[PDB]
Write a protein that binds this ligand. Structure first.
Ligand SMILES: Cc1cc2nc3c(=O)[nH]c(=O)nc-3n(C[C@H](O)[C@H](O)[C@H](O)COP(=O)(O)O)c2cc1C
Ligand code: SF4
Ligand code: SF4
Ligand code: SF4
Ligand code: SF4
Ligand code: SF4
Ligand code: FES
Ligand code: FES
Ligand SMILES: [Ca+2]
Lengths: 142, 156, 148, 907
């Protein structure tokens, strides 16, 4: 039996539309006291920021959860699962394919791009939350 | 394919004599071009700029700033109804509602045939004489909703 | 007036040469602000300017400039033709001369009347403007336009 | 000068300054957006609000703006007044109503002035529940991305671009809360100084597009103080590295040289460092096969063949450091050392050096240029070569409006009042070129003519200033009228500036400019002279000396030189390609020490993996003569263990010791600099350019990384989970880590990056200066090698004859481009689209005689080769001339002043 807030294995989650939630903002990497996160930003032709690589060194990780609370997209979360063990320390280094799970985890509904002003596919300018339509300077109305 | 006409060009250079700087003629140059064509097209911005000897971003800055200088195509007759405070007390909202029934548009939009464009405007300086509107250079005062169809018929 | 010799060069035989112009605006309310009128006259976006300096020293095209309202300038011929003493003794009040005062709204007689300073607002409303229209009560009044 | 009372305390400040720049100099934090130290005060954002009292007893005063308020004697202000604090919080609250929720995906994040001021006011709670305004974006070209939603309408971008930088294609549009900052239509920003907008804009509207391809936050960067390598001006820069690749280029404040601004070639021309084609290991040829060697093997292998050779010659480079050329000179001997530039380019460079050292006329620094009252530019297309001088000359031309305003008692910081008083009045600027320049919008007169005609106008100005100067017979009355206009402005100036350079390709233009400066010096004027050179260490290589590259090629093809050690030089730019490739095939041993892949390394026998400026240390000497040190940014061996990239001076010194005593010597940087000072007296100042590797701030080494640097136990964890040791720096005072010092008040001149608590943006440079917009607190880095000589020169009497066209022979008129003419930066992929198509420019009468129009491909012959180019039409180009783009792929800069024997339509 584990409580919901248990600080075991670190995963990266997904949007309800099915895209990866991480926007490679590097706040989780800097807020970690042990320095166990390395990542690089990439950008799609759509314009969506996403991580080119995501690397967590689980030999160094102390499972403090400061990365989860730093994340402004709810992408990185700590799950109730302590079942880890390896013969080699090199196999404690997890890449993005070992971390990205198929769903949204603890926060089923939050999508960051719906908040964001930046324009990606499916959300042009004025299609975000509390956002009006763009008015051109050449418009006849004063 | 904009070209400055030989009479528009002479009218712009006529008003450059009345100032120290040719930059000062920029407002009148935009109104000269708009008077002939209904609105100031996009190619007129670079055209006016090279005549006056100022950059095009200065000309475009002036034209977007001033409300009456138009940078979008309008109708043959522009309807400008007052929506300020004294006209609000005298019943402009009934005039606006009558204009939206006869024309079947909303303010800022042109009619489907392109005869009329409907625009709100500030106080026309005719506050004592009732609700006010302008069609082109003509001022009509003491407006009533019943008078709206007969008034519009004059402008074809 | 240009063909009666009241404008142009050598006005009335004196050395004074004055040339008057009319230039129409493009429709922004901030152009009535006096430093933003100077920028609009110069052919710029009509931002205001910071004072100091004043336009009396640095105004239009960096030249000494004075900006005056139409009704201020119309008082000036009355003063010089009749005298400084006539203008002072029009009203026994701390504000000299006559003013264009009026009432607008849902009143019986909206209009404009030249009146001296120190005329009370009730006199304008009830004797000149004829009071409110019938079936209307008086709630509030703005004395001098929309900014007051 | 003045004493003011702030929050009960009392301070001494300069009376001429306003209250924002007074209080920021004392370390009092006032928030601000629309003010800039370079741009002046306009009063737009209303963020700098303080409460001002009439005297000490006035308890209830008024809110003023400190950027718009003079710091007069007797001023009583309160920054921490409750009503002032609430209003300053409200200004941030009003700006936060329309701001997008974009900080995770904003490239300004962590380096954002709006983020810093929002925290500094203490506004953290949103009350506004309504909709936000949105804007569409524009395309601004390959360098700058556009996101208008983040704009706070501070007007800094337009005030920099139109007022300061004199760009024409950026403005403000619209009105009320719908104001839009940008271009009238999409397209590339035309200004050569567009890239300073990324530092000038306090938000993320204008951001670096070259950095957003490989983005990282500021705290993850590794910084070093470096010098720009793209031309001779010597702008101080702060390059940042992450994961072994150079990421962005930042401006490094230097109050003597560049201060807040860089040019676009410096800011965006760094991409050649990040090429995959660069050599990373030493490579030795075996017939057709290639063998990879380590550092020890390469030195023992090279010195075995070098011991058996009968004569070894050395070819230096103008783009190599002073320590690298000297080490090459020490290895072959000074009798066998060649400079690597052509003889005609060498002759113009030593004459340019002669007038600076022996002319007796002071040569101003880049910021001192802005104080001069008249500027004559002879031959140097200065916007395309030496672009920051053109920015400095624009500010000098605005000094006339500052003089008029000072007479009317308008303060120096009230910029909109000064500009209104001015009204297109300018200090006189006279430029001469072969065609139109980018300074033509502000120039009093432009003179388009061939280079001998430009020199002949220069000698005639000197003869009209002094009777003892030699005269130019044959001047027509039309030109004679204009010469009198220039002479009356020059003689009537209190402080004239004379600008020329080596890029015109004429010895006579440089001779004409020294005659004008001499004639003004005899009149009593405080005259300055400025010469622009070609490369980053052109002046340093000229002080060292040596024979020309043509002499070196002679010693190869006449059999006497058995071996040649080429150092960081692609010889095709300086000499004919067919001659170079033939003479390098006769040599038994060719050795190249370059960081870039060049064409001459195909047949070379040994290539050494030299380091670029990002991976090296050294001293460069700029056009002024200032020796400046550049420091290594990152160790390239840390990420890739097979990388054997050493400094050029470290490779050549070790090779000399293995040649002498068979033992390699990997020397330290201060031993090489000490060796320079002993042998060359003219380079004695380089010791004092920077301190040595034993310099400490109270026992601490200067830090390269910010204290919040991340990923220490995960950066290299994909190769080995065991953390490697941190790279150790024995050359310089800097450490390859964050465990060091970067305090704003630390007693040093070399500042790798600016950061302060509560100031994460480029506005943190105010904490590192003595007064804001002034000099660095403990002095700007760099030392002048030579002082002004007591006595001057004689008048040059070598007046050229007037230019005459010839049938068949066509003179080559040089055209330069900021994004194409420089050797390293044209290999950047972002510069491939910013550079124009290759062309050939002709007079309309000469194209009518040839029978061609615009766009026709025409063929010509240079040195027995054939190049076909499309024709362009140039009305200002005089007949008999032919415009070529210098320094491109195919057109060497040695071609300036050459002749084209044959020209006909291509078939
Ligand atoms: C927003 C604003 C709008 C103004 N509009 C006008 C105007 O339309 N007409 C006018 O005479 N003064 C206007 N003013 C006042 C002028 O700035 C200035 O005080 C006046 O023209 C001075 O002339 P006077 O001495 O004759 O009154 C306006 C002021 C402000 C702040
Ligand atoms: S996991 Fe969260 S905090 Fe870390 S980079 Fe991705 S979005 Fe940013
Ligand atoms: S849980 Fe703590 S130690 Fe582990 S990655 Fe997150 S911040 Fe670093
Ligand atoms: S400009 Fe600054 S405040 Fe605005 S989204 Fe970018 S980082 Fe955040
Ligand atoms: S674009 Fe940037 S610099 Fe220009 S007004 Fe907006 S926030 Fe200020
Ligand atoms: S002016 Fe020269 S040194 Fe300065 S940034 Fe531009 S290219 Fe670099
Ligand atoms: S308020 Fe309507 S015209 Fe004045
Ligand atoms: S910084 Fe002073 S008002 Fe903007
Ligand atoms: Ca080193």
């Amino acid at each position: 039996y584990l409580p919901p807030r248990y600080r075991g294995r670190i995963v990266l989650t997904r949007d309800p539309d099915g895209e990866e939630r991480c926007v490679a903002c590097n706040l989780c990497a800097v807020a970690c006291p042990v320095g166990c996160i390395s990542l690089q930003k990439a950008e799609t032709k759509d314009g969506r920021w996403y991580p080119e690589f995501f690397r967590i060194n689980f030999s160094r990780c102390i499972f403090c959860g400061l990365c989860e609370e730093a994340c402004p997209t709810t992408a990185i979360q700590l799950t109730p699962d302590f079942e880890m063990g390896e013969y080699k320390r090199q196999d404690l280094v997890y890449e993005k394919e070992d971390l990205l799970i198929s769903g949204p985890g603890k926060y089923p509904e939050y999508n960051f791009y719906r908040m964001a002003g930046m324009a990606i596919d499916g959300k042009d300018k004025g299609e975000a939350e509390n956002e009006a339509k763009p008015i051109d300077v050449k418009s006849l109305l004063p | 394919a904009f070209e400055l006409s030989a009479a528009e060009r002479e009218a712009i250079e006529h008003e450059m004599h009345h100032y120290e700087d040719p930059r000062a003629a920029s407002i009148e140059a935009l109104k000269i071009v708009q008077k002939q064509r209904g609105w100031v097209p996009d190619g007129a911005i670079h055209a006016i700029a090279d005549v006056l000897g100022i950059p095009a971003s200065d000309v475009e800055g002036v034209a977007t700033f001033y409300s009456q200088i138009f940078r979008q195509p309008v109708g043959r007759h522009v309807i400008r109804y007052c929506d300020s405070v004294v006209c609000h007390i005298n019943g402009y909202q009934g005039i606006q509602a009558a204009l939206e029934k006869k024309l079947n548009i909303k303010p800022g939009q042109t009619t489907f045939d392109g005869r009329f464009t409907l625009l709100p405007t500030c106080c026309l300086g005719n506050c004592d004489k009732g609700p006010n509107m302008m069609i082109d250079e003509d001022t009509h005062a003491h407006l009533t909703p019943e008078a709206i169809p007969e008034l519009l018929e004059r402008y074809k | 007036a240009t063909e009666a010799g009241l404008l142009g060069k050598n006005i009335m035989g004196t050395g004074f040469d004055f040339e008057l112009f009319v230039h129409t605006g493009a429709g922004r309310y901030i152009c009535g602000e006096e430093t933003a009128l100077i920028n609009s006259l110069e052919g710029r976006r009509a931002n205001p300017r910071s004072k100091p300096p004043f336009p009396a020293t640095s105004g239009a095209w960096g030249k000494p400039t004075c900006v005056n309202n139409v009704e201020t300038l119309c008082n000036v011929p009355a003063i010089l033709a009749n005298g400084v003493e006539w203008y002072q003794n029009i009203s026994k009040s701390k504000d000299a001369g006559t003013k264009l005062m009026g009432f607008s709204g849902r009143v019986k007689n909206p209009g404009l009347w030249e009146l001296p300073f120190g005329t009370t607002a009730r006199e304008i409303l009830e004797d000149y403007a004829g009071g409110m229209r019938d079936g209307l009560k008086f709630k509030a009044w703005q004395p001098g336009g929309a900014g007051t | 000068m003045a004493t003011i009372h702030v929050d009960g305390k009392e301070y001494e400040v300069n009376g001429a300054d306003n209250l924002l720049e007074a209080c920021l100099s004392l370390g009092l934090d006032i928030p601000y957006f629309c003010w800039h130290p370079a741009l002046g005060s306009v009063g737009a954002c209303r963020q700098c609000a303080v409460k001002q009292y009439q005297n000490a007893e006035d308890t209830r005063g008024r809110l003023v703006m400190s950027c718009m308020t003079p710091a007069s004697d007797g001023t009583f202000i309160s920054i921490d007044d409750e009503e002032a604090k609430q209003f300053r919080e409200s200004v941030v609250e009003w700006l936060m109503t329309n701001h997008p929720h974009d900080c995770p995906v904003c490239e300004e994040g962590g380096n954002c002035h709006l983020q810093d001021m929002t925290v500094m006011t203490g506004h953290s709670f949103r009350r506004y529940r309504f909709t936000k305004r949105t804007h569409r974006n524009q395309d601004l070209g390959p360098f700058i991305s556009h996101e208008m939603n983040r704009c706070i309408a501070c007007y800094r971008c337009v005030r920099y671009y139109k007022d300061y930088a004199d760009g024409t294609d950026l403005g403000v549009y619209g009105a009320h809360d719908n104001v839009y900052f940008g271009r009238p239509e999409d397209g590339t920003l035309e200004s050569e100084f567009s890239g300073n907008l990324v530092e000038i804009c306090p938000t993320g509207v204008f951001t670096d597009k070259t950095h957003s391809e490989r983005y990282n936050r500021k705290w993850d960067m590794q910084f070093a103080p470096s010098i720009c390598q793209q031309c001779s001006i010597g702008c101080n820069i702060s390059p940042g590295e992450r994961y072994g690749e150079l990421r962005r280029i930042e401006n490094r404040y230097n109050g003597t040289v560049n201060h807040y601004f860089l040019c676009d070639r410096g800011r965006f021309g760094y991409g050649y460092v990040n090429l995959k084609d660069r050599p990373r290991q030493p490579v030795q040829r075996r017939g057709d096969d290639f063998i990879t060697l380590n550092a020890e093997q390469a030195m023992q292998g090279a010195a075995d063949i070098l011991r058996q050779s009968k004569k070894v010659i050395g070819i230096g480079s103008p783009r190599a450091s002073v320590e690298s050329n000297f080490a090459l000179r020490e290895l072959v001997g000074e009798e066998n050392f060649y400079t690597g530039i052509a003889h005609g380019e060498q002759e113009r460079l030593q004459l340019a050096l002669k007038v600076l050292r022996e002319g007796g006329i002071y040569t101003p620094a880049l910021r001192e240029i802005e104080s001069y009252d008249a500027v004559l530019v002879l031959g140097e297309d200065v916007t395309q070569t030496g672009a920051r001088v053109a920015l400095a000359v624009r500010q000098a031309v605005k000094g006339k409006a500052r003089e008029m305003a000072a007479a009317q008692k308008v303060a120096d910081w009230q910029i909109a009042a000064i500009l209104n008083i001015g009204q297109r009045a300018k200090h006189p600027l006279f430029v001469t070129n072969v065609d139109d320049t980018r300074l033509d919008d502000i120039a009093a007169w432009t003179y388009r003519a061939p280079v001998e005609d430009q020199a002949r106008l220069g000698f005639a100005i000197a003869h009209a200033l002094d009777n003892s100067a030699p005269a130019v017979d044959g001047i027509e009355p039309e030109l004679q009228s204009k010469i009198d206009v220039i002479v009356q402005a020059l003689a009537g100036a209190k402080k004239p500036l004379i600008i020329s350079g080596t890029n015109a390709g004429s010895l006579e233009v440089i001779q004409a400019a020294a005659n004008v400066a001499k004639a003004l010096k005899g009149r009593g004027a405080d005259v300055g002279i400025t010469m622009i050179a070609r490369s980053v260490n052109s002046m340093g290589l000229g002080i060292m000396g040596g024979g020309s590259l043509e002499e070196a090629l002679t010693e190869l093809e006449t059999g006497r030189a058995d071996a040649v050690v080429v150092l960081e030089n692609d010889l095709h730019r300086h000499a004919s390609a067919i001659r170079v490739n033939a003479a390098l095939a006769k040599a038994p041993l060719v050795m190249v020490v370059d960081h870039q892949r060049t064409a001459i390394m195909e047949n070379a026998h040994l290539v050494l993996s030299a380091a670029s400026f990002a991976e090296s240390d050294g001293t460069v000497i700029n056009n002024e003569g200032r020796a400046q040190r550049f420091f290594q940014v990152y160790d390239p061996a840390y990420y890739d263990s097979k990388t054997v990239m050493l400094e050029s001076w470290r490779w050549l010194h070790s090779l000399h010791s293995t040649l002498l005593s068979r033992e390699v010597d990997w020397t330290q940087l201060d031993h090489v600099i000490d060796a320079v000072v002993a042998k060359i007296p003219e380079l004695a100042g380089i010791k004092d350019a920077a301190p040595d590797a034993t310099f400490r701030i109270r026992g601490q080494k200067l830090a390269r990384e910010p204290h919040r640097y991340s990923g220490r136990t995960a950066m290299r964890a994909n190769i080995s989970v065991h953390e490697p040791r941190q790279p150790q720096d024995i050359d310089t005072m800097f450490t390859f880590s964050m465990e060091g010092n970067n305090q704003p008040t630390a007693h040093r001149s070399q500042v790798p990056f600016a950061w302060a608590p509560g100031w994460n943006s480029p506005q943190a440079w105010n904490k590192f200066q003595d007064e804001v917009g002034g000099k660095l607190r403990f002095g700007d880095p760099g030392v002048r090698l030579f002082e002004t000589s007591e006595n001057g020169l004689d008048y040059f009497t070598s007046v050229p004859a007037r230019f005459q066209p010839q049938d068949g022979k066509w003179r080559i008129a040089p055209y330069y481009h900021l994004f194409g003419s420089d050797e390293l930066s044209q290999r950047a992929p972002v510069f491939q689209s910013r550079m124009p198509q290759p062309y050939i420019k002709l007079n309309p009468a000469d194209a009518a005689k040839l029978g061609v129009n615009a766009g026709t491909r025409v063929s010509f012959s240079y040195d027995g080769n054939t190049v076909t180019l499309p024709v362009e039409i140039a009305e200002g180009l005089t007949a008999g001339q032919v415009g070529l783009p210098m320094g491109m792929s195919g057109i060497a800069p040695v071609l300036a002043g050459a002749h084209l024997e044959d020209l006909k339509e291509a078939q």
